[PDB]
Paper text:
To estimate the K-874A binding region on the S protein, we reconstructed the cryo-electron microscopy (cryo-EM) structures of the recombinant S protein trimer and its complex with K-874A complex, and fitted each molecular model to the maps.
Numbering used by the authors: 27 to 1140
The structure:
């Protein structure tokens, strides 16, 4: 009975307070949807190998998730440890049902906690016995009592069956216990749903747990009615087991601050979107996510085919050394070092290691080493460091300003002593000959140069820098002789040659695996190197340290370190409300390795992803799984690349079909760009429209976003004194950036008023509305709303999150508090601000309305200058003249033009209202600032390598002097991140103001006059255009012409009448097939071919195209 751990195992990792935040992190987690070993009964061979024991001892394996159910209190406690005996320490963790008792005692092995053994009474056994499992308590170490973990007490309130889901962990010796209780109804299968597990007690027990079991106390059974021997264990408590693995997650809360749901950050390519995006709902499109890797484990990986220890003790058990001046160097090479037995034994007085941190010594492969043997005076040892100076340092031995291995110093009065003392060591005295690191000078400085202004010619007597060291064994301490060696490692100058005493193991290929080549501890898949290497080349960093290929130091063969098969992972999903399945794409990677792996591929189970027989597909964009190609091409919604798209809205597959799955199948195809049609080229004929279908489109444009700002400081500084002290010593940085905030913010308002204040004066609707049958109702404002806010823009407002997803009312705030007047944004907590527009919506609107009124009633003139009356009839007529249509057509066809107009308006509102997110760019900016702002928010929480992210604590619990560096590093980082944030807003400021200029143009040209530019203001011959604001934006109605209902017409540019080539003044000569007439290109107005509607010039004969006809002259 193995069963998916459907969603069970998730807990509370730490007790840091938080509310409704998608924080991703990683720990030892039982896999979800994962097999859990049921352990139920005594069923045959479940009791063999034991003493009729039902639920065997099990491997700990780094973590256990534990769960039991019952009708009534049955399941007793557990026992943990290495071996569960008195030989090795044990853990006895028992629920007395009166109290939970936890003991790390060394109790004798219990084959059964319930064995038929007892010695106080009649010899059989039973619960008559007083906890017979309590074998003996010798060398007990820990004892603890707490409240029971009662199992039925959960189920008592609701009269149901229950479970208790458990996670036992031992991290850093701390044995953390996380808990939960819940009712069930099904006992056959693991329930679907969700729950969280919270820490009960941490126990710093510090025993390597590897074996564990569950304990039960057998009373009896009633399966067969014979005797007390019918005390069958069959029908005893069952349970599940799984183990915990280091995989990443995501975790969520509710209003009450409690976990209600989670999305896994190590489960599924689909799930990884909801992880990385930090959403529980992913939208339609293509989304790229983070790659994966396998467990961190490996042996001593690959040290050279060299294996022989170095003779270190010679340096160390040596009785003949030199003085501090006579600092010798000794060569270490071509052997295996050890720094365990070196480090471990108790001989060294000084051991301190520089630029090198002393643990992994025995896994360090070195190129070469330098043993600096000499004897020092006891107090001088502190001066053995870079940054020291002194007679020994400045005049016996110096240090470079780069890495030197170690310092080893130790008293030598057991070998440097003669009862008469030791004058037998020496050092140089100062003589102003200051030198550089590592001069083995032994020159006798008896006479100087002489011309030096500090020596030679300066007042000397019998002085000799060679100063002997006079030891005495009866002299005391401080000046006792201290033999000292300077360890200095060269690394990376060559193949490393001397390694620590750690034998490496074999190597694997093509699997994502770490490794360590002579200290080169790297990772990836191992691909055979196709390079003719060069034999004095060990590792090839093809560019900028990228040690691309490696030659192993045991087999001497070359290996391209391909970083384990590397290629982007992106998803193809229709959304979340749509469905919960995904296509798996890898970027320019042929699916030849694992197609896709969460830590490994799998053949039959839920990871079923095959490069053949599964939903494999191959492109220049790399191989696809999930995606089955199909031949038919259509348009693209979720892109992939090269037109290859995985988006069919309506599939022929019924069951799943979501938008990218097709009955459990992601589909594959390419953008079809539209239909296919030859238009019949001829050299002599047109089709000129005999009707039209004008259209009005929706040109949607954001005009602004929030003029936020920040108290840079109180953002950062949170109003702290020493905070501000260190803050200022950086300085105007804050000032710089928020000055930018200023310029850009005021800038956007200038942009807005700019896109609005094009006119001197303000117009109102004329009360009578007899405007040629063109209804303006819905576009126009109505007094019923505050300040005559137009129907259309009201819909705009409602269609958008005026609240902007409520940045006054997301995860709420201080409720009803200083949060001021209920519509803008921005969740102000501290440091930050936003300032409401200089132009509130109301003016913004009534501008636009004045715009409208002018362009209707006075047309060209209201913004150009004085607004002058004109019938919008003949105004529209002149605008047809602007698109080149005579006022004849409008005159004749005024009513249907009106009707199309107003119907178009209605369709406009139909769209904008019905179509959600029609406004993309608007709410785009909204979202943009949303994240920018909110990120900025989160960035307070970045500890930045400090010991705490909050300024408060880092200042508080620290004395200032040390607090200086942490405070600083934080100042640096958060400051920096702000400055970044600033920069990004700047990015917008730019692209915004660009769009803003664009839109100001859009209005000015297409509205104060008539756009005559191609697709500037919408497809077609523009007539008029109209302003439709958004709280940070504007949309535009556009009156453009589209002809229709065409018919063939053979043509002739000239009419060859009366020996003279006659041509049409305005248009082209047209025929029905038999009658030659004149009409222009955008409509059939066949005309009697007159000299009035034509003209004569040149000759008719020389060039093709003409016909012969007659022409009528006035």
């Amino acid at each position: 009975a193995y069963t998916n751990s459907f969603t069970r195992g998730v807990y509370y990792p730490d007790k840091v307070f938080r509310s409704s935040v998608l924080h991703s992190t990683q720990d030892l987690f039982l896999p979800f949807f994962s097999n859990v070993t049921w352990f139920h009964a005594i069923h045959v061979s479940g009791t063999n190998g034991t003493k009729r024991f039902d639920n065997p001892v099990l491997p700990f394996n780094d973590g256990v998730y534990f769960a039991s159910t019952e009708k009534s209190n049955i399941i007793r406690g557990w026992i943990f440890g290495t071996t569960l005996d008195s030989k090795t320490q044990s853990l006895l963790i028992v629920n007395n049902a009166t109290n939970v008792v936890i003991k790390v005692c060394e109790f004798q092995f219990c084959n059964d906690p319930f064995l038929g053994v007892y010695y106080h009474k009649n010899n059989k056994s039973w619960m008559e016995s007083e906890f017979r499992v309590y074998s003996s308590a010798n060398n007990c170490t820990f004892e603890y009592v707490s409240q029971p973990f009662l199992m039925d007490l959960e189920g008592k309130q609701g009269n149901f069956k229950n479970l208790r889901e458990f996670v036992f962990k031992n991290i850093d010796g701390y044995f953390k216990i996380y808990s939960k209780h819940t009712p069930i109804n099904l006992v056959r299968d693991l329930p679907q749903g969700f729950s969280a597990l919270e820490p009960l007690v941490d126990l710093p027990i510090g025993i390597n747990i590897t074996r564990f079991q569950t304990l039960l106390a057998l009373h009896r059974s009633y399966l067969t009615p014979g005797d007390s021997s019918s005390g069958w264990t069959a029908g005893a408590a069952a349970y599940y087991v799984g183990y915990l693995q280091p995989r990443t997650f995501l975790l969520k809360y509710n209003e009450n601050g409690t976990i209600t749901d989670a999305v896994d950050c190590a489960l599924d390519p689909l799930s990884e979107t909801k992880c990385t995006l930090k959403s529980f709902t992913v939208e339609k499109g293509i989304y790229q996510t983070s790659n994966f890797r396998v467990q961190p484990t490996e042996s001593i990986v690959r040290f050279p085919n060299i294996t022989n220890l170095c003779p270190f003790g010679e340096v160390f058990n040596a009785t003949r050394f030199a003085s501090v001046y006579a600092w010798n160097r000794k060569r270490i090479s071509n052997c295996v070092a050890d720094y365990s037995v070196l480090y471990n034994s108790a001989s060294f007085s000084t051991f301190k290691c520089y630029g090198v941190s002393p643990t992994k010594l025995n896994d360090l492969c070195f190129t070469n080493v330098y043993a600096d043997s000499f004897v020092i005076r006891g107090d001088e040892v502190r001066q053995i460091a870079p940054g020291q100076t002194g007679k020994i340092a400045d005049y016996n031995y110096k240090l470079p300003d780069d890495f030197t291995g170690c310092v080893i110093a130790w008293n030598s009065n057991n070998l440097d002593s003669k009862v008469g003392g030791n004058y037998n060591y020496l050092y140089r005295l100062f003589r102003k000959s200051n030198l550089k690191p590592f001069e083995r000078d032994i020159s006798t400085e008896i006479y100087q140069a002489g011309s030096t202004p500090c020596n030679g010619v300066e007042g000397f007597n019998c002085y000799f820098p060679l100063q002997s060291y006079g030891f005495q064994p009866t002299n005391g301490v401080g000046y006792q002789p201290y033999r000292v060696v300077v360890l200095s490692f060269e690394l990376l100058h060559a193949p490393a040659t001397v390694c620590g005493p750690k034998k490496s193991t074999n190597l694997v290929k093509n699997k994502c695996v770490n490794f360590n080549f002579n200290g080169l501890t790297g990772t990836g898949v191992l691909t055979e190197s196709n390079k003719k290497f060069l034999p004095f080349q060990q590792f090839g960093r093809d560019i900028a340290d990228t040690t691309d290929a490696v030659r192993d130091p045991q087999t001497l063969e070359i290996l391209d370190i391909t970083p384990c098969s590397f290629g982007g992972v992106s998803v193809i999903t229709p959304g979340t409300n749509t469905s919960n399945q995904v296509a798996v794409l890898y970027q320019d990677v042929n699916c030849t390795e694992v197609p896709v792996a969460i830590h490994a591929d799998q053949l039959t189970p839920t990871w079923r992803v095959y490069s053949t027989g599964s939903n494999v597909f191959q492109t220049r964009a790399g191989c696809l799984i999930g995606a089955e190609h199909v031949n038919n091409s259509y348009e693209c919604d979720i892109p992939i690349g090269a037109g290859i798209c995985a988006s069919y809205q309506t599939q022929t597959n019924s069951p799943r079909r979501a938008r990218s799955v097709a009955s459990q199948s992601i589909i594959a195809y390419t953008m079809s760009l539209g239909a296919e049609n030859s238009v019949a080229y001829s050299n002599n004929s047109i089709a000129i429209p005999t009707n039209f279908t004008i259209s009005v489109t929706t040109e949607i444009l954001p005009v602004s976003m929030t003029k936020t700002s920040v108290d840079c400081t109180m953002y950062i500084c949170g109003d702290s004194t020493e905070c501000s002290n260190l803050l200022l010593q950086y300085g105007s940085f804050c000032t710089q950036l928020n000055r930018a905030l200023t310029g850009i913010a005021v800038e956007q308002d200038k942009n807005t008023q700019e896109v609005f204040a094009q006119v001197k004066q303000i117009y109102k609707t004329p009360p009578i509305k007899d405007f040629g049958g063109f209804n303006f109702s819905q576009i126009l404002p109505d007094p019923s709303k505050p300040s005559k806010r137009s129907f259309i823009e009201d819909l705009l407002f409602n269609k958008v999150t005026l609240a902007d997803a409520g940045f006054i009312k997301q995860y709420g705030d201080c409720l009803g508090d200083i949060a001021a007047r209920d519509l803008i944004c921005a969740q102000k907590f501290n440091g930050l601000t936003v300032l409401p527009p200089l132009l509130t919506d109301e003016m913004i609107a009534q501008y636009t309305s004045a715009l409208l009124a002018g362009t209707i009633t006075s047309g060209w003139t209201f913004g150009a200058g004085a607004a002058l009356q004109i019938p919008f009839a003949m105004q529209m007529a002149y605008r047809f003249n602007g698109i080149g249509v005579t006022q004849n057509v409008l005159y004749e066809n005024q009513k249907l033009i009106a009707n199309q107009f107003n119907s178009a308006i209605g369709k406009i509102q139909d769209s904008l209202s019905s179509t959600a997110s029609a406004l993309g760019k608007l709410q785009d900016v909204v979202n943009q600032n949303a994240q920018a702002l909110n990120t900025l928010v989160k960035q307070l929480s970045s500890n930045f390598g400090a010991i705490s992210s909050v300024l408060n604590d880092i200042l508080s619990r620290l004395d200032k002097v040390e607090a200086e560096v942490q405070i600083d590093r934080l100042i640096t980082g958060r400051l920096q991140s702000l400055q970044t944030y600033v920069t990004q807003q700047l990015i917008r400021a730019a692209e915004i103001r660009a769009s803003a200029n664009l839109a100001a143009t859009k209005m000015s040209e297409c509205v104060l006059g008539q756009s005559k530019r191609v697709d500037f203001c919408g497809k077609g011959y523009h007539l008029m255009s109209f302003p439709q604001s958004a709280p940070h934006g504007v949309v535009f109605l556009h009156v453009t012409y589209v002809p229709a209902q065409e018919k063939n017409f053979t043509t002739a540019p000239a009419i060859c009448h009366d020996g003279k080539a006659h041509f049409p003044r305005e248009g082209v000569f047209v025929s029905n097939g038999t009658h030659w007439f004149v009409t222009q290109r955008n409509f059939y107005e066949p005309q009697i071919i007159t000299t009035d509607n034509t003209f004569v010039s040149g000759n008719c004969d020389v060039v093709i195209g003409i016909v012969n006809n007659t022409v009528y002259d006035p």
